[PDB]
């Protein structure tokens, strides 16, 4: 087993990975490492797709989505929540502190305030300016030193989405799925398409059915390529990629289109790698 190891989506994943490695390199839990890592990007206002610099919906509101899943089937999720900069920690709190698994809208903000999170204005002058002018997610999965898996996914969703729109990031089996006997996967791309195909639950069930992380990501994407063609859609218009990790610390990735990148931090260091791709 290659462990610990963290992977996360896109360039900003390298930095997010340095925060996660601070936990993991000291034999910390995968759960704490992935929450710590994606929180770095939620706090960053120049990170315009996750938390605090997020581009608002078409009504000018920054509403955030997130979910988390640990090594023993516990899960927490929040969607279309406003004024809380760290939705991954409110999602963790849904998991640890309620009988429920997903809270949305005003009920999710009411629960967050009840837990001590502080209401903040997440609309930056830069995002407000671009919004009025107009008028993706970070996923991270990790295997810690105990050989346990966890993942976290967080986004501001599509810029100028309809008020109330939810993507794949707060949905288990769409933006994130972890099963500690098999592996973990997180998704990148168009929310709607990852939901439609329930993509990450499919990646992990193909690792369950014997596939390598890389093979599983590729076959999943290829299943998605066949569905957009059956839907009569042009592949150039839709993107979807996955990164995956199994129990032995092997990892893989694949996407419909070229141009995505993901960060891998293990004991060889942190690096940006480039997936295989179909088109």
Swiss-Prot record:
Q: Where in the cell is it found?
A: Periplasm
Q: Which GO terms describe its molecular function?
A: N4-(beta-N-acetylglucosaminyl)-L-asparaginase activity; peptidase activity
Function of this protein?
Cleaves the GlcNAc-Asn bond which joins oligosaccharides to the peptide of asparagine-linked glycoproteins. Requires that the glycosylated asparagine moiety is not substituted on its N-(R1) and C- (R2) terminus.
**Family assignment from sequence similarity:** Belongs to the Ntn-hydrolase family.
This chain belongs to the protein called N(4)-(Beta-N-acetylglucosaminyl)-L-asparaginase
Active site residues according to the UniProt entry: 137 (nucleophile)
Q: Which organism is it from?
A: Elizabethkingia miricola
Question: What reaction is this protein's catalytic activity?
Answer: N(4)-(beta-N-acetyl-D-glucosaminyl)-L-asparagine + H2O = N-acetyl-beta-D-glucosaminylamine + L-aspartate + H(+)
């Amino acid at each position: 087993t290659n462990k610990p190891i963290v992977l996360s989506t896109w360039n900003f994943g390298l930095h997010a990975n340095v925060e996660a490695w601070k936990v993991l390199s000291k034999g910390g839990k995968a759960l704490d490492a992935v929450e710590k890592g994606v929180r770095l990007v939620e706090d960053d206002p120049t990170e315009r797709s996750v938390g605090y610099g997020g581009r608002p919906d078409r009504d000018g509101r920054v509403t955030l989505d997130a979910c988390i899943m640990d090594e023993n089937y516990n899960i927490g999720s929040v969607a279309c929540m406003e004024h809380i900069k760290n939705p991954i920690s409110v999602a963790r709190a849904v998991m640890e502190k309620t009988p429920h698994v997903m809270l949305v809208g005003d009920g999710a903000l009411e629960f967050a305030l009840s837990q001590g999170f502080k209401k903040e204005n997440l609309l930056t002058a830069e995002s407000e300016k671009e919004w009025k002018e107009w008028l993706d997610a970070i996923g991270m999965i990790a295997l810690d030193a105990q050989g346990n898996l966890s993942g976290a996914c967080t986004t501001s969703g599509m810029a100028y989405k309809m008020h109330g729109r939810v993507g794949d990031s707060p949905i288990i089996g769409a933006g994130l799925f972890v099963d500690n006997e098999i592996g973990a996967a997180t998704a990148t791309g168009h929310g709607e398409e990852v939901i439609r195909t329930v993509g990450t639950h499919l990646v992990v069930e193909l690792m369950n059915q014997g596939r390598t992380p890389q093979q599983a990501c590729k076959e999943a994407v290829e299943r998605i390529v066949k569905i957009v063609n059956r839907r009569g859609k042009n592949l150039k218009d839709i993107q979807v990629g996955f990164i995956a990790l199994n129990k032995k610390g092997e990892y893989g990735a694949y996407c419909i289109q070229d141009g995505f990148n993901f960060a891998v931090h293990d004991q060889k260091g942190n690096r940006l790698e480039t997936p295989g791709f179909a088109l």
